[PDB]
Design a protein around this nucleic acid. Structure first.
Ligand SMILES: Nc1ncnc2c1ncn2[C@H]1C[C@H](O)[C@@H](COP(=O)(O)O)O1
Ligand SMILES: [Mg+2]
Ligand SMILES: [Zn+2]
Ligand SMILES: [Zn+2]
Ligand SMILES: [Zn+2]
Length: 89
DNA sequence: TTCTCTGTTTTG
DNA sequence: CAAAACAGAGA
């Protein structure tokens, strides 16, 4: 059990290493930056930054493999929701 | 609806 | 292992 000390947080984590990284939730630094030209967005989590760049490019890399489905997604959560909903993969 | 945040899982 | 990615929730 690795429990967060702070405030009215106190949730526990599968791991101690993640408990340490979790602390960025209760700090205000947003050290990751958007590499797009003159976008001022900043982040704490690298995955947010990765998905975010697709708003700039328009990409839709998540492609449903179900025969004849044909659907594509910009964001992994959406792709997971659709599999969940539908049963594809 | 689009998208970001984050705890856990997968990949390398 | 650490980094990348997922899956879920929900702003
Ligand atoms: N369902 C849904 N889809 C899309 N965008 C949404 C939704 N609900 C709220 N928002 C938007 C509206 C706020 O300007 C933004 C951040 O809210 P937060 O800072 O409280 O999230
Ligand atoms: Mg920039
Ligand atoms: Zn906490
Ligand atoms: Zn940006
Ligand atoms: Zn599908």
């Amino acid at each position: 059990r690795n429990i967060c000390p702070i405030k009215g947080c106190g949730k526990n984590f599968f791991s101690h290493k993640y408990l340490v990284q979790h602390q960025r939730v209760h700090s205000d630094d947003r050290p990751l930056k958007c590499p797009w030209k003159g976008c001022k967005m900043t982040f704490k989590w690298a995955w947010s930054r990765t998905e975010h760049i697709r708003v700039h490019t328009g990409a839709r890399p998540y492609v449903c493999a179900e025969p004849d489905c044909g659907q594509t997604f910009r964001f992994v959560s959406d792709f997971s929701r659709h599999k969940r909903k539908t049963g594809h993969s």
